Design a protein around this ligand. Structure first.
Ligand SMILES: CN(C)CCCC[C@H](N)C(=O)O
Length: 212
């Protein structure tokens, strides 16, 4: 557990208040199990809803892999993400499940494939998907404030970070102790940022500053 209070005192810094974040006040319970299938937007084509399997769980997050794709493009979503739903959600809403961009077979093999993977599949029940947290009405972050942020280049990691700059609804996230290469702009509504102390509360590892 990272000592945020000692860290904020020594850097003469404030953590961004919880009201800045589109995150729940308390980290949502994660009742997903490895092997459970669900529906997720394909990160490599966000127009597509695809079948994903939980291949890992960490705190309130799921490590997801699209069935029929590859093991090199796994992605992480919170259990209260609006980009994941129970199987059947897409159809109920007038849509059609799609092959993943990285589908390992040819496209005419898709309809048969879906039948095969869904047959006696372990499926995440709709009740374990958590409600979408309220969002702030505006960007309330201020330059200099610290927070916990996903390293988008190594998304298993959530790390000590600082708001470097602000432009309207976008905040600039920089990772304490790391070269500016891991920096990124995101919307203040990002699900990839958390108030200080959130990881410890959710049982997710939280990376201390880098040694540079
Ligand atoms: C924590 N995060 C901001 C940086 C992670 C970088 C790890 C990588 N293997 C490296 O050593 O470059």
């Amino acid at each position: 557990a990272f000592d945020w209070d000692a860290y904020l005192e020594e850097t003469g810094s404030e953590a961004a208040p919880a009201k800045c974040f589109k995150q729940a006040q308390n980290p949502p319970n994660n009742d997903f199990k490895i092997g459970m299938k669900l529906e997720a937007l394909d990160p490599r084509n966000v127009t597509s809803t695809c079948i994903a399997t939980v291949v890992g769980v960490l705190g309130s997050r799921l490590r997801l892999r699209l069935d029929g794709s590859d093991s090199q493009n796994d992605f992480w979503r919170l259990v209260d993400s609006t980009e994941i739903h129970a199987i059947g959600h897409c159809e109920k809403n007038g849509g059609m499940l799609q092959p993943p961009l990285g589908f390992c077979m040819n496209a005419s093999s898709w309809p048969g494939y879906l039948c095969k993977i869904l047959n006696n599949a372990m499926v995440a029940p709709e009740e374990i998907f958590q409600p979408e947290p309220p969002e702030p009405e505006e960007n309330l972050f201020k330059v200099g404030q610290k927070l916990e942020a996903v390293d988008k280049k190594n998304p298993q990691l959530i790390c000590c970070a600082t708001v470097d700059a602000i432009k309207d609804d976008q905040i600039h996230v920089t990772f304490d102790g790391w070269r500016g290469a891991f920096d990124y702009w995101c919307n203040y509504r990002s699900r990839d940022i958390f108030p200080a102390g959130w990881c410890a509360r959710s049982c997710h590892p939280m990376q201390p500053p880098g040694h540079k």
